[PDB]
Amino acid sequence: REINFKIVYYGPGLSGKTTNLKWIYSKVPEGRKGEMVSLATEDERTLFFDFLPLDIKTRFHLYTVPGQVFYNASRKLILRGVDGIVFVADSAPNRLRANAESMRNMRENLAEYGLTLDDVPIVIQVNKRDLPDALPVEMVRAVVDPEGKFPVLEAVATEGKGVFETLKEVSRLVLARV
Amino acid sequence: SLVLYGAPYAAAVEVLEETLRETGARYALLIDRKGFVLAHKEALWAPKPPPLDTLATLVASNAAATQALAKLLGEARFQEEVHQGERMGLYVDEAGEHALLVLVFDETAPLGKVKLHGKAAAAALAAIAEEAL
Amino acid sequence: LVLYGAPYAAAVEVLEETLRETGARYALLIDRKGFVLAHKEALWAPKPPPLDTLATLVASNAAATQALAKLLGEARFQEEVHQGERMGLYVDEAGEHALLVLVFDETAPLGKVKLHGKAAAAALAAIAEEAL
Numbered sequence: 380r381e382i383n384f385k386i387v388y389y390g391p392g393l394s395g396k397t398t399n400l401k402w403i404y405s406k407v408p409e410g411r412k413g414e415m416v417s418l419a420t421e422d423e424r425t426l427f428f429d430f431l432p433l434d435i436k437t438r439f440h441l442y443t444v445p446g447q448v449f450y451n452a453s454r455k456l457i458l459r460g461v462d463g464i465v466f467v468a469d470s471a472p473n474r475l476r477a478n479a480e481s482m483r484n485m486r487e488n489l490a491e492y493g494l495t496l497d498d499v500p501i502v503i504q505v506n507k508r509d510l511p512d513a514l515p516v517e518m519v520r521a522v523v524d525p526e527g528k529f530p531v532l533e534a535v536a537t538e539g540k541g542v543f544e545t546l547k548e549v550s551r552l553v554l555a556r557v
Numbered sequence: 558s559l560v561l562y563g564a565p566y567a568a569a570v571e572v573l574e575e576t577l578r579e580t581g582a583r584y585a586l587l588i589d590r591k592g593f594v595l596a597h598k599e600a601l602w603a604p605k606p607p608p609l610d611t612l613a614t615l616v617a618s619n620a621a622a623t624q625a626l627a628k629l630l631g632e633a634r635f636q637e638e639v640h641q642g643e644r645m646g647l648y649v650d651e652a653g654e655h656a657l658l659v660l661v662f663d664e665t666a667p668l669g670k671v672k673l674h675g676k677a678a679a680a681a682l683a684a685i686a687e688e689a690l
Numbered sequence: 691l692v693l694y695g696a697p698y699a700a701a702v703e704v705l706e707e708t709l710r711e712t713g714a715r716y717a718l719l720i721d722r723k724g725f726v727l728a729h730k731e732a733l734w735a736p737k738p739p740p741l742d743t744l745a746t747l748v749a750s751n752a753a754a755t756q757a758l759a760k761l762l763g764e765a766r767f768q769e770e771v772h773q774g775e776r777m778g779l780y781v782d783e784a785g786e787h788a789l790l791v792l793v794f795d796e797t798a799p800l801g802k803v804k805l806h807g808k809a810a811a812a813a814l815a816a817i818a819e820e821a822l
């Protein structure tokens with residue numbers, strides 16, 4: 380009947396993690412989706428997580444994690460059992476370091492589960508390519524994936540650009556392991 | 558993961574229907590700690606339930622967060638949880654290390670029987686879950 | 691919601707008293723984003739586990755359980771008491787914008803915990819309101 384998979388969206392505050400789910404939700408037909416759930420603060424910064432369940436019998440559970448540094452304890456929990464990860468990096472000059480800290484943070488959290496960055500498929504999304512001062516892609520990429528060992532996709536998640544292909548690619552990788 | 562197919566699944570469903578009979582509860586679920594609905598049953602008499610997937614992520618994450626707090630207080634675990642409104646309530650308990658028993662109930666169901674059979678049901682499902690890991 | 695000056699001294703005074711009346715180790719007043727607004731430790735008790743972590747977890751948890759309530763047509767569930775072999779935790783709303791947490795061990799009698807717990811929450815609620 381049905382295999383279940385968990386996908387997590389990771390990355391620094393404001394990089395667009397929640398926006399990816401909002402897009403995806405707005406374009407998947409009713410019949411291939413359940414309702415989206417968000418536990419967010421008053422300023423729509425995610426506090427616990429987002430959750431969106433979907434069809435592609437293979438069921439994908441997508442989650443977002445809160446990116447702000449001081450929400451680490453909830454971030455940890457949301458990675459439990461993860462099967463595939465989308466790391467959404469920010470394109471803004473002033474957020475490059477935020478990117479790297481979040482990546483170092485993701486290795487630290489996985490290591491508490493006994494997992495390395497080799498153990499879970501990971502897809503890098505460089506989001507926010509519309510910004511006037513957008514850093515070159517390979518610079519942002521060099522910071523997060525110094526060895527180029529992870530697929531890269533460019534995105535403007537506020538407009539849909541890259542949202543689904545990023546999703547397809549992490550999907551592709553998770554199935555290729557099963 | 559946790560492959561719940563075949564004879565385990567049928568046993569699991571049997572424990573859930575029996576639990577609804579004995580307790581007067583509206584909805585019974587077996588979920589995993591990741592959030593995945595593994596088996597569920599509704600009291601025939603009961604209205605349509607709220608979206609079961611929403612309910613299951615919320616309960617997984619509530620179990621995960623309270624278990625994180627037990628851990629940071631030096632404790633292996635807290636006790637089973639009952640959440641109680643003016644009319645509606647939830648009973649959540651451990652179905653072994655990988656799963657949760659959820660029961661949703663209302664003002665018609667005697668809380669005492671919820672806990673007593675809630676507990677019995679949890680232990681029965683632990684037993685089925687261990688045979689299917 | 692930031693407590694400072696006199697409102698802050700007021701909140702501190704409720705926490706010390708609550709700690710004395712119950713035998714609990716630590717009492718916190720946290721906002722619903724998980725920021726610690728104030729706190730006190732009993733002089734006799736160990737160095738606490740990390741309270742910023744504790745607060746975040748407590749606030750996340752409150753988000754989930756408010757969301758379960760709403761999903762069942764309920765305004766809220768009631769106050770929560772979590773209990774282990776020896777350690778426990780009392781959580782209660784102190785108004786719309788904040789929570790009161792008490793952390794206690796086996797020497798804190800549960801009845802006292804709940805009674806004073808409830809009163810502190812009410813007290814803290816009023817300080818938080820009259821601070822706007």
Ligand SMILES: Nc1nc2c(ncn2[C@@H]2O[C@H](COP(=O)(O)OP(=O)(O)NP(=O)(O)O)[C@@H](O)[C@H]2O)c(=O)[nH]1
Pocket residue numbers: 390391392393394395396397398399423424425426443444445446447506507508509510534535536537538
């Ligand atoms: N220009 C531009 N803005 C974007 C893009 N993606 C998201 N934004 C904006 O960035 C802000 C943050 O988006 P959000 O998804 O809430 O970020 P998040 O990663 O979920 N943040 P957090 O971890 O705090 O929940 C919003 O204003 C959103 O519209 C983008 O690709 N380009």
Ligand SMILES: [Mg+2]
Pocket residue numbers: 396397398423424425443444445446
């Ligand atoms: Mg978010």
